[PDB]
């Protein structure tokens, strides 16, 4: 389960 978080100032993918 790949988690993709994109928003102003931050971007990452939680395990």
């Amino acid at each position, epitope marked *: *389960r*790949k*988690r*993709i*978080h*994109i*928003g*102003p*100032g*931050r*971007a990452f*993918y939680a395990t």
Partner: antibody
Amino acid sequence: QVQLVQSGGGLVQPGGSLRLSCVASGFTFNNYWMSWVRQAPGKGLEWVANIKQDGNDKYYVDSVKGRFTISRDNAKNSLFLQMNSLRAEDTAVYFCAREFSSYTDHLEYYYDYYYMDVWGKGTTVTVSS
Amino acid sequence: QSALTQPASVSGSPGQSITISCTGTSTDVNGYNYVSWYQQYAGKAPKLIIFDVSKRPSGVSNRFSGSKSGDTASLTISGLQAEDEADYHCSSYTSSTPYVLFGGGTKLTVLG
């Protein structure tokens, strides 16, 4: 209805400082990330800074890191922005906006995207020598 | 390395359709879908009208639609009305700080 009202704008000289306020109403403030976006006369928009719902995680655009400090007080539905070492290029209208989560889950993975759905009317900041 | 590009201005007459392009959005598969558009009337605050490339917040007219192919995002307005006259800004993801960009904005004029 949902509303956001900022204040604190004004005229200062290079190196001066200002403290912007933003009062929310009509929504659970401590559930959303809050941002500050600016617009220089006759130009487009530019995100300046935001803060997580727990007030810890803070992000800024590179040109203001060190000079600008964002903070919030969930107790009073308020968002703030302390501006120090102001420059001429910082001249613009400042808006505070709410970041909302657009969640789309496809099991193996999911997208958690944030966009600004609520905006205040904006407060003016002029920096001139 | 990154900067969204939308024409400074566009015109159209009542009843027609018009399109505003925005090159430079992300082609990264994980950020491809992060695209939005905001409408802004002179002196007023922006308003989200399209997010996730082509979704509409409730209340926004189905005359406004969004699409994307390659790195180019496109906003389309059909049956132009005098009240459609405003500034339109595209927003998109970018793999590096600040992660979310804005175009220069497009001034749409409705020849009234």
